[PDB]
Design a protein around this ligand. Structure first.
Ligand code: HEM
Ligand code: HEM
Ligand SMILES: C[C@H](O)[C@H](O)[C@H]1CNc2nc(N)[nH]c(=O)c2N1
Ligand SMILES: C[C@H](O)[C@H](O)[C@H]1CNc2nc(N)[nH]c(=O)c2N1
Ligand SMILES: [Zn+2]
Lengths: 414, 416
């Protein structure tokens, strides 16, 4: 009924009862596990041209409202009862409803808390929520986004934040941020199909150019934003350079590293995910925290389909790249992650290494075990891309399931 | 489009569909409600002791399926020999309650079980396996002889060869043939007065069991344990492996001259001996198998795990790294050198070994072959991706579908 969860490094055991509260299905079935897959299809977020089944929506709505009032120890209170009646009344007459800022703030934090793929959830209680539901144009979205960036960056002392734009409305286009992150380096298709810059951003780089952007020719050219207001062609907005803080990468001992001319931005702001609270959907709700060094040092800079700088640093380190057994790849990767941590600390910009991060996640697991009886976690995503078993999370079994509020993936707007 | 799991490789952007999972006849631990893919032993395959004979109905179904697999493998499906072999199995189960496998069927099943192992990254070698038939074995002493021959052939003085030795299958209300040790080669785990452990903490229980059975314990950090072999309805008998048969490799580093002074070492042969081999319903409770190590098994897990030898801090102190702060990545640096030491030492000793890069690259090739041969390959991502440099290897970027196929190697409860 309830899964027995074990930590093999300590011998400790727990039972996940929280999973019982999951009302949404994942990709697995008793015949086969699909937990290693990145995207669903069944868990996506289909169009919104028609009103969501009043029965469905109301159910999800009552549940969330119930959650909210429990959180403020006012369950069964007068306000609780009248709030439910309001939601019922609004849905019944308009086929939808709206949240109060306080409830929105609660929903946003809960969505983060329920994010199975986030290793930094111990910070889930400290989140600055910018209500931008009073947005009616792409130009306004841009101002909000510029303020979110200014606040979150805080001159290098990053602070977690999220900005929530208008909810989806039946038969009306969605407010969407086309870029996957608020800060993305351009990826220019050159010569023989090769790519200058960030291969991951080739498509978005092309769309920008198509919408009037004057491309550059560097490896780290900050892309413009394509903000889109309902049923309107997206608009191009250039981010003020002074707002986009970047960190030049150098190595604590390897003098030549700096020569490589590598750099990375300080603000990790996902902007293509959908935020669902009480059945309501927010197609544009950009959120940001601070980077865990492996995201940059290992995935972004070392992935074969990303910057793929592994061989370069290896050759500079004069490593034997003739064979796998020399572990030249493992050696350069460690120096690159070291360089990221070194540089960020030198620039006085918030960042967390994978050891510190996973240790804090273990504490979070414990806090949640006592607080909710479990904690949805995606093992494949929580374990760092390098030095896996060298971290506590590797030796920790985890249960994965869908709780709401939740951050979900949604189709690309184009 | 296709009504099967869509699998993607994010490095290459290639897509495949796994249709082989449709052949899975056994349910795993996940449900649409929650994924338990990260649990080491969810209560699923777990071949718990089912004494009283199995439902002739259930066994027959499993047996017919296996026989079909066999005749298909030889390309004689639907033939007269196929139908006659099917009749024979049914007749045998009808009169005895069980049945027996022909020689070539056992070889086929042994390999299919390896081929079907979701947690094995070395499956590209699945076709090359030496199958020692030991279904005639009638004593714990004879079990020891068989095992010794296995080790000799498998070790082959450094040039390791994969092999499995199959002892008598489980029989109606009779005792099982069991090897108590999890592996043919295990280092003792001595519990100290202060509560710590000298040697390998993973083997504390088996060590205390050998002692309780008359073994005179040593006090080293790497004392090779004796084997506790158990023939049907008999108490386990203790057997000490002839030192000359247990090939070991002293560990040294290619450039850090002091590493050898650590006196670390590991045995060359990885022989899992506590798993149950299941074929067409028949259960071989004792069927030790061995291949060759992937360097991370030794260098990352066995030597650096917190609950194993835990030598990370000692090696870092020796490398004079700042072990007072996580951001120095002293754990990462020490781990890389320790792993290099294992690859270096094994190569020096001319003992077969494969790094996590070469191994994963070959598994990707294996996935390609299997997509073509069977339309899929059951794989456990958490176990396929190496314990270090995960995303530096190709498997990290390959989505995988996990499911249970038989023949199979399953976990089984400890005999004690
Ligand atoms: C406070 C610092 C934070 C750190 C260090 C952190 C770290 C991480 C890491 C390492 C990942 C995986 C990134 C990847 O591999 O692409 C991630 C994913 C995620 N985080 Fe956090 N996180 C933090 C804050 C936040 C905040 C503020 C939110 C939301 C309000 C959040 C929501 C998520 C979600 C939904 C995912 C999955 C995104 C996806 O599927 O692409 N995180 N986080
Ligand atoms: C030729 C060399 C081989 C290599 C490099 C290889 C490598 C591996 C690795 C890395 C593991 C994981 C070990 C762990 O984390 O505990 C493993 C597991 C496994 N391998 Fe292979 N393998 C090979 C040969 C074999 C053979 C010959 C068989 C059987 C006939 C086999 C059956 C399995 C099974 C059942 C598991 C899972 C065992 C468990 O759950 O602990 N392997 N193998
Ligand atoms: C195929 C596999 O699911 C994929 O490569 C996953 C693995 N783990 C991950 N973990 C994190 N944090 N981020 C990722 O993008 C991934 N990618
Ligand atoms: C909890 C988690 O499932 C566990 O630590 C797994 C992860 N991956 C593994 N992978 C391999 N090859 N071997 C193991 O023992 C494990 N342990
Ligand atoms: Zn699953």
């Amino acid at each position: 009924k309830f899964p027995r969860v074990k930590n093999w490094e300590l011998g400790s055991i727990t039972y996940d009862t929280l999973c019982a509260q999951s009302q949404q299905d994942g990709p697995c079935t008793p015949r086969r596990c699909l937990g290693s897959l990145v995207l669903p299809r069944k868990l996506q977020t289909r169009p919104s041209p028609g009103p969501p089944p009043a029965e469905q929506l109301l159910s999800q709505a009552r549940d969330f409202i119930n959650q909210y009032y429990s959180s403020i120890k006012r369950s069964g209170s007068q306000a609780h009862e009248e709030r439910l009646q309001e939601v019922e009344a609004e849905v019944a007459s308009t086929g939808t409803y709206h949240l109060r800022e306080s409830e929105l703030v609660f929903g946003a934090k809960q969505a983060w808390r329920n994010a199975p793929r986030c290793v930094g959830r111990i910070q889930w209680g400290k989140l600055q929520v910018f209500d931008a539901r009073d947005c009616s144009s792409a130009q306004e979205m841009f101002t909000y986004i510029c303020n979110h960036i200014k606040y979150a960056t805080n001159r290098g002392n990053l602070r977690s934040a999220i900005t929530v734009f208008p909810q989806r409305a039946p038969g009306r286009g969605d407010f969407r941020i086309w870029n996957s992150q608020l800060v993305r380096y351009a990826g220019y298709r050159q010569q023989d199909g090769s790519v200058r810059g960030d291969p991951a951003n080739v498509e978005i780089t092309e769309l920008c150019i198509q919408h009037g952007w004057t491309p550059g020719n560097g490896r780290f050219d900050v892309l413009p934003l394509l903000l889109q207001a309902p049923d309107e062609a997206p608009e191009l907005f250039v981010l003020p350079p002074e707002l986009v803080l970047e960190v030049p990468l150098e190595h604590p001992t390897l003098e030549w590293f700096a020569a490589l001319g590598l750099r990375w931005y300080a603000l990790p702001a996902v902007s293509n995910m959908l935020l669902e609270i009480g059945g309501l959907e927010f197609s544009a709700a950009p959120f940001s925290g601070w980077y865990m060094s492996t995201e940059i040092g290992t995935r972004n800079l070392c992935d074969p389909h990303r910057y793929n700088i592994l061989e370069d640093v290896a050759v500079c380190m004069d490593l034997d790249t003739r064979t796998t057994s020399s572990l030249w790849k493992d050696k350069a990767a460690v120096e690159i992650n070291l360089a990221v941590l070194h540089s960020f600390q030198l620039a006085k910009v918030t960042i967390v290494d994978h050891h510190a991060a996973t240790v804090s996640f273990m504490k979070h697991l414990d806090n949640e075990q006592k607080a909710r009886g479990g904690c949805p976690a995606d093992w494949a995503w929580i374990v760092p891309p390098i030095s896996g078993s060298l971290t506590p999370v590797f030796h920790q079994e985890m249960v994965n399931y869908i709780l709401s509020p939740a951050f979900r993936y949604q189709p690309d707007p184009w």
